Amino acid sequence: MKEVVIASAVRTAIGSYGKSLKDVPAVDLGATAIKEAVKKAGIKPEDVNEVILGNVLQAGLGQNPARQASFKAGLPVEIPAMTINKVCGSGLRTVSLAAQIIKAGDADVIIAGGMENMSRAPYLANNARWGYRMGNAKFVDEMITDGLWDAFNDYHMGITAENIAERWNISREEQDEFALASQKKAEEAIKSGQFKDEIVPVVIKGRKGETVVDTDEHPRFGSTIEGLAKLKPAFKKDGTVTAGNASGLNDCAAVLVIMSAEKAKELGVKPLAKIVSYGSAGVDPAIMGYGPFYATKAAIEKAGWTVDELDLIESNEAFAAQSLAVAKDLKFDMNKVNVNGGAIALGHPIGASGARILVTLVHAMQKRDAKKGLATLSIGGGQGTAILLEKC
Amino acid sequence: MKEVVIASAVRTAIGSYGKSLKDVPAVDLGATAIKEAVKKAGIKPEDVNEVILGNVLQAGLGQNPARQASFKAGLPVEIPAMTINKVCGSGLRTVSLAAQIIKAGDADVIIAGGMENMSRAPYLANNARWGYRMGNAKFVDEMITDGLWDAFNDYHMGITAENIAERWNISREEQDEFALASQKKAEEAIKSGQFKDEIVPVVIKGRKGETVVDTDEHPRFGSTIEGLAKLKPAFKKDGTVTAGNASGLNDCAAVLVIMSAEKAKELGVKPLAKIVSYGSAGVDPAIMGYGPFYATKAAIEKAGWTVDELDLIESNEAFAAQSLAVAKDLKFDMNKVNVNGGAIALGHPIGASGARILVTLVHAMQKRDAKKGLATLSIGGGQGTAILLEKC
Ligand SMILES: CC(C)(COP(=O)(O)OP(=O)(O)OC[C@H]1O[C@@H](n2cnc3c(N)ncnc32)[C@H](O)[C@@H]1OP(=O)(O)O)[C@@H](O)C(=O)NCCC(=O)NCCS
Ligand SMILES: CC(C)(COP(=O)(O)OP(=O)(O)OC[C@H]1O[C@@H](n2cnc3c(N)ncnc32)[C@H](O)[C@@H]1OP(=O)(O)O)[C@@H](O)C(=O)NCCC(=O)NCCS
């Protein structure tokens, strides 16, 4: 097989629900990231063979959101594009799909990653076409239905976290301590400039002014264990899961240029990392948060690695409960996990999230000179996906 | 690299808008086709490595429609799934994506295809979440916006068909004659049993009864040139494109089992066709209907074939105008094109359409003993995709 590398890795800041990125469509976040990713790779727009982007809340975004992001980015109309939906895994899975297509001999350069604007999701009327006839009906929150609700069990993803808290015996306190540690890591990383290299600014041009968004806004600086302990349960009576130990609803795009090592050499690109292996797996939807266990095991086996060999790990924090279960069973050294904070603090912009963690991983590997890295995350509907990277 | 084969190919009947399959969600049509494809292929569900399905109108369908179809088919939960949106080409692109993943060394057996229920598309309120504040707004038809409207030029796909008609001087009369020919061929094919081997019946459990849908209902038997000439332009004043010479809005699923030739031999499968090559291409969105010209050329070049070596062709009839343009420029022998009718008569269920013409092609190739086949179609947003088959 051809070897496959990451040439550049870029993301917008992660905006909070209804806040900083509320007026910026997902496809415009995506275009902002694409332009800057192409520029950071040091290639020309004409060098890209395909665009593959994750997006989950596609409702009313218009034909083929990936194609829209591409066009708005200045990429030639000649380049094909497609939009992938694997829920939370979308943005990570496009990167392994890119690797697969390159290994198949069909391209040398692919723009991958994902984009999401949860703040902009519509409401739906399911029976307006042919009519309600009589009686009240549901005005459906598309964000919940398309992104956050289990289609088999008829409950919120937060209930899948409670299921994991119950079965693995992970206490509210353990969940709150994990959340607090993520907040503290995120604050320290932001203030020490760890994200400065990876974040492309988004310029919001209104009728009257320009505003620049370039800082993650979701973290709660000065978080305390007492603050967390007082929070009410978010999903069920007497639940362990709360807004403080669950990831948020957020807006972001994150994009990587993926290439064959031989194309990168030819074009003078200095790659950030090699994509070593990857894997995807399914699990019972009721415990979807455990998906990364199987996906990580598959990818590691494929690579001929072990977990102990890993230098840095990004394991997406959909919920403390599930992150803890996964870490425990994979026996992670928690000092190597989400060293710049995770999604409890930073947010979870579902379509983008997988790509966002990989962006974060590859920049952290460069800065810390770490040789081997893992990114993996859980997927609503009962899946996991993972990618292993090696420094070039 | 590994050789890639099609082990089975099945579709539901194509229902008309608001009619026979109005009460059957896309994911249920998909599940129906998946179960029958796995059966026809002669494999176990546990031999399947991934499910990759096209679906365009995802709004309110719940998390990850491909996973839902996979789950409702009875496939084991350990199998991963993802949903692809490349508009009209979604269903065909999943097949070449499967071939790429297999060629990459990452799987041996993939369920691919597409599913769509256009009758069931919701209406949307885009600003219900944070408020309209004041003034009337749009109650958005999600089928139009997500499937049929150009995101760049702000007009219907039918206007892209007028554009081609104007550029190429394809007259109303020429479009109507092409339409009539498609209708006659579909009638002949339906009545002569050509679609019997490929159609899986859909069993609808109504309160009143149990009903079975197993026949394509869109064709209009006894269509006449005079009947076509009386129709009004559907998209612009004094236009050439009408309801009669455009494809319809339709509901269907079409699924294929794709495997390495090595695995097929190990499992005792007798394949239907080898996948020889494939391609995708982008064009200006305004002339999207021309996408197959470039896609087809790429595929044929990769294969080192020529157009005149083709024994059967399925070139999707999004509109008579664009089918006629692609056909003139690729120089097709029209007697080998859409021999069982095309989408003007049969319908165009967007996410499934590209898989549906591939199903139709492979069955037609076994019936007529043809050696080489091409499936190609246009994509809204200015793309094309194509697959080349050689009969085993
Ligand atoms: C949990 C959830 C319902 C909360 O949504 P919300 O009510 O809009 O959340 P908010 O961020 O507004 O938080 C509400 C209040 O909780 C409190 N809160 C949240 N995090 C806190 C923290 N670290 N410390 C103290 N208080 C906190 C605050 O009081 C906040 O009010 P404020 O913003 O005025 O201070 C939502 O984030 C959610 O659904 N998350 C899970 C997402 C998910 O399932 N993703 C898919 C994973 S597979
Ligand atoms: C053209 C379009 C708007 C028509 O929608 P519609 O009005 O719902 O179409 P209908 O099937 O109801 O047809 C309307 C009337 O036209 C007439 N008609 C359609 N096909 C006909 C034919 N072969 N002969 C005679 N009359 C015909 C009929 O009178 C019909 O009324 P009836 O069924 O009551 O007899 C719709 O099919 C469309 O938008 N098609 C294009 C889809 C598209 O763009 N797809 C994407 C491609 S990239």
Residue numbers in the entry:
A (entry chain A), B (entry chain B): 1 to 392
According to the publication:
Here, we present the crystal structure of C. acetobutylicum thiolase (CaTHL), a type II biosynthetic thiolase that catalyses the first step of n-butanol biosynthesis and condenses two acetyl-CoAs to acetoacetyl-CoA. We reveal that CaTHL, unlike other type II biosynthetic thiolases from aerobic bacteria, is regulated via modulation of a redox-switch, indicating that n-butanol production and the relevant metabolic fluxes in Clostridium are tightly regulated by thiolase. CaTHL consists of three domains: an N-terminal α/β domain (N-domain, residues 1–119 and 249–269), a loop domain (L-domain, residues 120–248), and a C-terminal α/β domain (C-domain, residues 270–392).
Next, the crystal structure of the reduced form of CaTHL in complex with CoA was determined. The catalytic residues such as Cys88, Cys378 and His348 were observed to be located at the same positions as those of the corresponding residues of ZrTHL, indicating that the catalytic mechanism might be identical to that of ZrTHL. However, the CoA-binding mode of CaTHL was quite unique when compared with that of ZrTHL. In CaTHL, His218 residue, whose corresponding residue is Tyr218 in ZrTHL, is involved in the stabilization of pyrophosphate moiety of CoA, and Ser223 residue is located at the position of Ala223 in ZrTHL.
